[PDB]
Write a protein that binds this DNA or RNA. Structure first.
Ligand SMILES: [Zn+2]
Ligand SMILES: [Zn+2]
Ligand SMILES: [Zn+2]
Lengths: 48, 64, 511, 49, 48, 214, 102
RNA sequence: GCCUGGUGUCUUGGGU
DNA sequence: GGATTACACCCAAGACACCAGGCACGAGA
DNA sequence: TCTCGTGCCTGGTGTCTTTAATCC
């Protein structure tokens, strides 16, 4: 249970849009802004 | 064609979970439960609509 | 009174002494809005002070609670929170006063109210458009699907008016593809589609000849009878009630191993309640559900036989507007359960000390007060921790740029379909909008055609009890459902009251 | 200066103008790279040279 | 009003994909039309 | 000898069960109530024991002979995850589940509470009963400068200066020992009693600043 | 709640004052003590809550050496040790104290 | 006696 | 039976963690 | 003067069950 949780945190640190499992959440309730989400979409590093 | 399916049911005898395999032969309307652990076997009739939960239910009533 | 009592139990062996702890909620009382300073002093709050000092114009709510203590060897006015008051309503301190004294309270006589004040900011509730409950709608399905026609209904109770469940009846089989063209249904909390005949048998009506007598009321219609042919044969081997009910229970999302002796008794709940709960939920009334089920299948086949067009989803008679009243009740319902569980979780610790709890220490008014304030201030319709998936934009800051804009803003309606989904059907001005929503007033841009505005003479139904209507229908000749036979009644008219088939009358013209 | 304005300057063939807009007139930055491994891992003390 | 508001985004997407497909195509000094890989798209621009 | 009490194949099985975090003690309690209430009836709860280890968050362990008894113990318990998540423990793993597990005068500890939270302190002595320890601490004082404290609005650390106290605001008790504002300072250090549970004795990492000072 | 240092049982502290320890009070006499005595023989600090339902057939109970005691809540680890004067008095009674603090 | 930092993430309403 | 796609720019107003445990201070006996 | 209760601040840690079309 503890090793899988280290795998989990390292995964959602890089990509928090993994299909088929719940997103990592901030205490405010909104999803964590992972590095992958920083680069994609209209406002990310590349298009924005 | 026969269907060989693994299930997450607990064997009623050896109590090992996730070790019951269901073989449903619809051509002859014969369903077969098998235990991958203690090796027991149970046969029951199946229709066309049946699923591993249908014969596993019949196995619970066949014991009690 | 939706969940009127809380109940605990312990089988005292520590001389067994069952000690049920029970708490009953009684009458509600309301007080006029009051400002309580940090001092402790109180006074009547009027809106002008509330705007200036960024306060919330709200009324304290008190609830009678009653304790009782069963013991077998074998309170008063507790404060539950503050509810924001709509200005100029019957519970606002401005409703009286009279024109002379309005000027002294710095209130303008042209201000017609209809809005709330939350942290000094004026918030108006936007009417939410939804589909009607308890009505059957038939739609056609796209080509790459084995289904061609679907009947759908969302069932919702009359009391409260709240959603319960949703149910579908799908007709499989494409055009010359799909072989046996049978019909299966979808039931709440069951993982797989179940053929129609099986659920008919599972309700207590088992021989074929009675089943077809409940659906088709025209023995000559061989086209319709030919389409029900494969449904009989695919559910022939299920020849009695018991094996039918068990076939259901073996799919209904439960645990593995509840045996036939009980797996029936679990499925009987999924049939008695959750399946069509708007008709009835008391026992021994399964004749109404069986008759209604036959009506659905009849309507399904009329569309598949091209004798009736599919329903028009935009027909305004199939639509409802949720205004301030219904919207608050749904939110208050969610929050009152949250307050309830916090009381229940608190009793299990405070009774292990065996100390009489002072009640006022077991009601945290922050649950309702912060809940209502947060949702009205942000528009997020739900619990704060679940801000996504909840609907946004229900509350908006009241536009005060000009007088005309205030009138329009208080009469606005919203359809919550999205910006995802192009096409045109919810955006078009449909013919049935005539005289009910404005044909001209609509925003430019992304909301165009989805946000609408009530015509000048429109009104919204407040709601009325259906019970006096039933009494009037039976007094003037309506005959019960147990007396009805398609061979004898091959011509009479069916009567619906809020979507439940309640009777039949042979001479509708006088009625 | 969005994506569509970028395309217009390409069509004009004004390559020099486009470079300046997106660098000198904005967020131009100087970095040091290693000629061997190509990474920006250089530690550069400019007063000690 | 609905059509103008809807179909403006349809054609806006069309223009974006067209530009990215074609942005690197340049006339070179030998008259050929080539992309950034030096693939020949036309041996002579516009055939004239 | 403890070695004669090791488990064997004849002993009951032990299953672990996942429960809501922080609710492990509650579940153990609830299981005991159910067991005791059903003793001697026709349907006894056929578990022998249940327990929860702090080091093992979110788990309860239950001792029985049949898996069905585990399901019986947890039935209706609102703190237990409904998924059929119990797991079997091996006999060779049993005793480690029940392993029960410092502080010496003259050694260093780190304080866990109060204005001295995070500060390094020497253990001077412990109470006869064995609960609180007298600590030698670099004080964080103001000499009553703004009188008419928290860890976020405290003072810098500096040895007590009795002449500064004499000048500005004090009881002499012995050679180099003063009581100042009802605390004791000996040769510049505060000597103050702390609960042993209020100090950290393990894995202390001296800081740069502490290496400079001590 | 406190835990008896001798037997490990977990009870509300006042119980140790009212009734003594149900396992130990024949030798510990906490029922007839003052609070200082109760607090020297029972600890507010303990870890590893154990429901023992069947002392005499539980392996868990045998390992924790509570197999001869009464069904109840016990602690795997009890912090503190019995005062040397009480240990000496117990030994006069033929009772051997095996500390439960680890 | 030169240097000189004031937020973000959303949502909603608008303009062409 | 799965995601990815869904014009551009701009303006402005309107908002923000919860629960439990421990320690300290004040009041009452 | 001592003990108990209440309030405030700081630190640590989640969970009752409840929009639509395309290709690859
Ligand atoms: Zn087996
Ligand atoms: Zn390098
Ligand atoms: Zn004891």
């Amino acid at each position: 249970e503890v090793e899988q949780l280290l795998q989990f945190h390292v995964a959602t640190y890089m990509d928090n849009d993994i299909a088929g499992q719940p997103q990592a959440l901030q205490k405010s309730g909104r999803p964590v802004k992972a590095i992958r989400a920083r680069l994609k979409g209209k406002e990310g590093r590349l298009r924005g | 064609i026969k269907q060989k399916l693994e299930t997450q049911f607990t064997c009623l005898f050896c109590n090992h979970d996730n070790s019951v395999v269901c073989t449903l032969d619809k051509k002859n309307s014969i369903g077969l439960l098998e235990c991958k652990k203690c090796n027991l076997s149970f046969q029951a009739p199946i229709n066309s609509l049946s699923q591993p939960i249908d014969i596993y239910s019949d196995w619970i009533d066949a014991c009690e | 009174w939706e969940e009127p009592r809380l109940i605990l139990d312990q089988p005292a062996q520590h001389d067994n002494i069952n000690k049920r702890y029970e708490i009953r909620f009684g009458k509600i009382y309301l007080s006029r809005p009051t400002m309580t300073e940090a001092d402790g002093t109180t006074h009547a709050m009027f809106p002008q002070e509330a705007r200036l000092r960024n306060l919330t114009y709200s009324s304290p709510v008190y609830l009678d609670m009653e304790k009782s203590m069963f013991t077998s060897i074998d309170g008063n006015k507790v404060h539950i929170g503050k509810v924001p008051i709509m200005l100029r309503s019957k519970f606002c301190s401005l409703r009286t006063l009279d024109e002379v004294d309005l000027y002294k309270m710095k209130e303008c006589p042209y201000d017609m109210g209809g809005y709330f004040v939350i942290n000094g900011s004026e918030k108006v509730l936007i009417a939410q458009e939804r589909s009607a409950a308890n009505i059957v709608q038939v739609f056609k399905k796209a080509a790459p699907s084995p289904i061609s026609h679907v009947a759908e209904i969302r069932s919702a109770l009359e009391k409260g008016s709240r959603l319960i469940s949703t149910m579908q009846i799908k007709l499989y089989g494409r055009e010359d593809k799909g072989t046996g063209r049978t019909i299966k249904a979808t039931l709440p909390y069951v993982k797989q589609d179940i053929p129609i005949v099986i659920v008919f048998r599972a309700l207590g009506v088992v021989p074929d000849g009675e089943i077809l007598q409940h659906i088709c009321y025209d023995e000559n219609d061989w086209q319709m009878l030919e389409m029900l042919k494969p449904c009989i044969e695919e559910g022939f081997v299920i020849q009695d009630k018991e094996v039918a009910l068990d076939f259901i229970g073996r799919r209904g999302s439960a645990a593995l191993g509840i045996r036939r002796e009980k797996r029936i008794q679990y499925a009987k709940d999924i049939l008695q309640k959750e399946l069509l709960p708007h008709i009835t939920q008391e026992e021994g009334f399964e004749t109404r559900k069986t008759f209604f089920l036959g009506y659905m299948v009849n309507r399904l086949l009329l569309c598949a036989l091209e004798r009736k067009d599919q329903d028009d989803r935009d027909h305004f008679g199939k639509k409802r507007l949720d205004l301030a009243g219904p919207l608050l009740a749904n939110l208050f319902r969610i929050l009152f359960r949250k307050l309830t569980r916090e009381i229940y979780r608190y009793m299990q610790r405070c009774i292990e000390t065996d100390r009489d709890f002072n009640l006022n220490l077991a009601v945290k008014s922050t649950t309702i007060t912060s809940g209502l304030k947060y949702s009205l201030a942000t528009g997020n319709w739900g619990e704060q921790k679940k801000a996504m998936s909840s609907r946004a934009g229900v509350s908006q800051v009241l536009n005060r740029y000009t007088y005309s804009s205030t009138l329009s803003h208080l009469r606005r309606t919203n359809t919550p379909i999205g910006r995802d989904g192009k096409l045109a059907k919810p955006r078009q001005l449909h013919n049935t909008h005539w005289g009910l929503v404005c044909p001209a007033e609509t925003p430019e841009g992304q909301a165009c055609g989805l946000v609408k505005n009530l015509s000048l003479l429109s009104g919204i139904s407040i709601g009325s009890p259906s019970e006096p209507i039933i009494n009037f229908l039976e007094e003037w000749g309506m005959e019960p459902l147990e007396d009805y036979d398609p061979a004898q009644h091959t011509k009479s008219t069916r009567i619906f009251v809020n979507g439940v088939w309640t009777g039949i009358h042979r001479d509708p013209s006088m009625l | 200066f969005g994506e569509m304005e970028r395309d217009c300057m390409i069509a004009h063939g004004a390559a020099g103008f486009l470079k300046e807009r997106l660098m000198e007139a904005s967020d131009a930055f100087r970095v040091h790279v290693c000629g061997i491994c190509g990474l920006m891992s250089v530690i550069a003390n400019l007063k000690k040279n | 009003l609905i059509d103008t508001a809807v179909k403006t985004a349809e054609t806006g997407y069309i223009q974006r994909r067209l530009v990215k497909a074609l942005e690197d195509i340049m006339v070179h000094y030998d008259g050929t039309t080539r992309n950034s890989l030096g693939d020949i798209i036309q041996f002579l621009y516009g055939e004239d | 000898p403890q070695r004669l009490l090791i488990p064997t194949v004849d002993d009951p099985g032990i299953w672990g069960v996942k429960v809501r975090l922080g609710k492990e003690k509650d579940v153990v309690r609830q299981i005991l109530k159910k067991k005791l209430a059903r003793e001697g009836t026709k349907n006894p709860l056929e578990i022998y024991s249940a327990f929860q280890r702090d080091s093992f968050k979110g788990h309860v362990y239950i001792e029985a002979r049949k898996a069905e008894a585990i399901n019986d113990a947890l039935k209706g318990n609102v703190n237990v995850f409904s998924n059929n998540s119990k797991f079997l423990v091996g006999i060779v793993e049993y005793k480690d589940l029940l392993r029960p597990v410092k502080l010496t005068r003259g050694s260093y500890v780190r304080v866990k509470n109060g204005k001295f939270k995070g500060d390094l302190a020497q253990v001077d002595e412990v109470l006869e009963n064995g609960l609180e320890a007298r600590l030698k601490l670099v004080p964080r004082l103001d000499y009553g400068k703004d009188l008419s404290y928290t860890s976020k609005f405290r003072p810098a650390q500096r040895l007590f200066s009795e002449a500064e106290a004499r000048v500005h605001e004090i009881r002499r008790d012995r050679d180099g020992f003063v009581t100042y504002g009802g605390e004791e300072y000996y040769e510049g250090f505060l000597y103050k009693t702390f609960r042993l549970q209020n100090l950290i004795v393990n894995s202390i990492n001296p800081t740069l600043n502490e290496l400079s000072l001590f | 709640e406190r835990a008896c240092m001798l037997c490990g049982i977990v009870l509300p502290g006042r119980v140790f004052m009212q009734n003594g320890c149900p396992n130990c009070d024949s030798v510990l006499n906490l029922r007839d003590s003052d609070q200082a005595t109760v607090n020297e023989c029972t600890s507010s600090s303990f870890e590893g809550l154990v429901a023992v339902g069947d002392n005499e057939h539980s392996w868990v109970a045998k390992w924790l050496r509570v197999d001869r005691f009464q069904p109840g809540l016990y602690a795997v680890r009890v912090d503190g040790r019995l005062p040397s004067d009480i240990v000496a008095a117990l030994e006069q009674y033929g009772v051997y104290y095996r500390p439960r603090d680890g």
